[model samples]
Target: HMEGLAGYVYKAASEGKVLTLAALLLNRSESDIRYLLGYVSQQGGQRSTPLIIAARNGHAKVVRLLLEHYRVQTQQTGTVRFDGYVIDGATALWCAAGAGHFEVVKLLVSHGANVNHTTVTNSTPLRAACFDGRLDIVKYLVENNANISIANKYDNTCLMIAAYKGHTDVVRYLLEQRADPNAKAHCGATALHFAAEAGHIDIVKELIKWRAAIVVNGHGMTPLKVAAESCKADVVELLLSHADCDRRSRIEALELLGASFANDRENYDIIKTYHYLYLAMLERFQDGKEVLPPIHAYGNRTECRNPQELESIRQDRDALHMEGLIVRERILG
Candidate 1:
């Protein structure tokens, strides 16, 4: 007759004889009490359930009792009907592992806990572990066959979470597990989206190593774009050195920035192209630049951002000046 049945069972399981003895003293059948324990096992808490508590407490005996003797019949496939308010809808396995309750984690897995099961809309346990830099648990999950490929409801994967969080060891572990470095969501944001925005140099290096697709965001938002705006020299250099670095994306990214700022899509792309020409600064551009010709034929609105953005733009335009990747050698002359 507890306000909520299973949560009460969970409480009884953890408190043990504190309440079990109380029940016995009141002439309650141990069977009814044990059954209550079973129901509560399914109930879970604000974080998870008795399993999380047992793990956090490092109670080997309580862990064993829940796994072996407790009668809680929580839902399978991870929809435990544990009360919503007190526990906030977390999966039991996530709470246990993230709480560093290795023993409780062991018990739950032995009972066939789904390491890859997501709750609250695709928030996986790997992501939760990465959020805390729980390397041991991360390795265990990987070895136990957890999915690293899954993104949370936010379109962030365990890898993205690790890189952005600047959890170096966790990122390394995931990369070793073959997590996609270029992984982007429907928004076209990559793990690099996180690292550059957060100003994490080491993470930027790691992402670059994995061949992160730069400037791929449909918005044309690239790590370099972010670095250019902030004047992070290290990040700027990191981006230029990336294999995906090129003139078109940077120009496009700049155009995107201008459009977003001015809210003038029609003219933004046009103006960026004009700067694209002035930046050519080449003898070939003496007569005309690739993008400049298009702009001259159209119109001119020659205003770009600060020197870093302009300088970054100039670097790409200059590359066209040098190798003539900007245009054909015939067109250059």
Candidate 2:
């Protein structure tokens, strides 16, 4: 019972305790104590490592405690390169970005944190900041001149990361910062792939505005393929339009995506065969009770759906239709 002052210090600081077990459990070595207080150096059994708590949650005081007193350092000498997954192989900058701890990051930068640290295959922090929606943190990092153009271990840049995670602002910001519009991540996926996959209209528009590619392309996956797989009709429309608007359009790429999705044996097919239609039929029954909209499905008009989406799904539907693509978008009776 060494009166785990480190534990108390962490708890007290987080809960705003100015005076608690610190008055009693004071046997901690000043340096060790500082280290412990700086970071909760002991917790959950074999805990010598700081808790995977995000830097943003490290109250300024706690951050100061660990840094000023505990001597908790980043990438210190002989310190077994603090590289492993708190989530991803994101380096410290990436960690700070994900946590949105702008100040902590600034401090880290002041301490010589690499503006473009990469871990476990060269994934950059800029991508981390953008993917996680750290708006202010991203802006700050970018302003500080973080490598906006570096791709991960793959060739995917921050734009692709932002697109994948549906960060519209980050997408635009990266574009404005001129961080390579046509960059692709792993397997040739651009931010367009991400936005389309998520059915993110604004983000897709923003990427397009930034001149991110919406080609009939992906590594081998087309924008339409992404839309079909993710069930994002809006994205499908945007992609199809890109194809139609550009007769030199890469519609073959887009069609390739459609084929891939049509042949996809993924879990989405389960819902198509049973769950979605069952639910739609049930909703129709409820509609009879005036409980909801008629719950009518796309009526073979599944592809290219958006409010202003007026494109006919006929051709593509015919293609996938023969493959049993249509399903009842209703609930059970």
Q: Pick the candidate with the highest TM-score.
A: 1
Give the Cα lDDT of each candidate.
0.57, 0.53
lDDT by residue (tens digit), candidate 2, 76-126: 211112233334344445566666677777766665666777755566666
Residue 83, candidate 1: how far off, in angstroms?
A: 18
Name the lDDT value of residue 232 in candidate 1. 47
For residues 199-247, write the lDDT of model 1, one tens digit per residue. 6888888777776667556656577766544334456556766546556
**TM-score, model 1 to reference:** 0.63
- What is the lDDT, from 0 to 100, of the residue 167 in candidate 1? 90
Cα lDDT, model 1, residue 41 = 47
Candidate 1: worst 10 consecutive residues by lDDT? 323-332
> Cα deviation of 147 in candidate 1 (Å)?
1.4
Provide the RMSD of all predictions against the true structure, rounded to 1 decimal. 9.4, 11.8
> Distance from true position, residue 276, model 2, in Å?
20
